[PDB]
TrEMBL record:
PANTHER family: COBALT-PRECORRIN-5A HYDROLASE. InterPro entries: CbiG_hydrolase, CobE/GbiG_C, CobE/GbiG_C_sf. It holds the Pfam family CbiG_C. Residues 12-136 form the CobE/GbiG C-terminal domain. One of its GO terms (biological process) is cobalamin biosynthetic process. The lineage of its organism: Bacteria, Pseudomonadati, Pseudomonadota, Gammaproteobacteria, Pseudomonadales. Signal peptide: none annotated. This is CobE/GbiG C-terminal domain-containing protein.
Amino acid sequence: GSHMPLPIPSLLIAGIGCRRGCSAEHLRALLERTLGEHGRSLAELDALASIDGKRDEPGLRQLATLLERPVHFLAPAVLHDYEPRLLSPSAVALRETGCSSVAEAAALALAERLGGGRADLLGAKRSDDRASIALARLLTER
């Protein structure tokens, strides 16, 4: 009947924070690793998220093009809303942006905006010395 409950737009968002000049190839390898840890395929990603600001973002834009999937850059003030929910505070991120984890905050922020309900991180962000990636999913889950 019309009361048929459709739950999941099962959205999966990757939030990314990285050093200046980080390549699409580097970001993609780290993204693939992060997805693998959580038994997610790159095919399952809906969008990428990061922080907006004045630096140009060609690595992220190239990654979005490779994936044929969008990248959204969110206001620092928006990311700040998610401070209390972050798992992996970053001294560099905090100093530079006002946000304790760009990857974690951007993932949550975008998932909730596209999804219109609460999102949860799949886990703490995965990091190397040039980038960090976090995954967020729209939390159904009756």
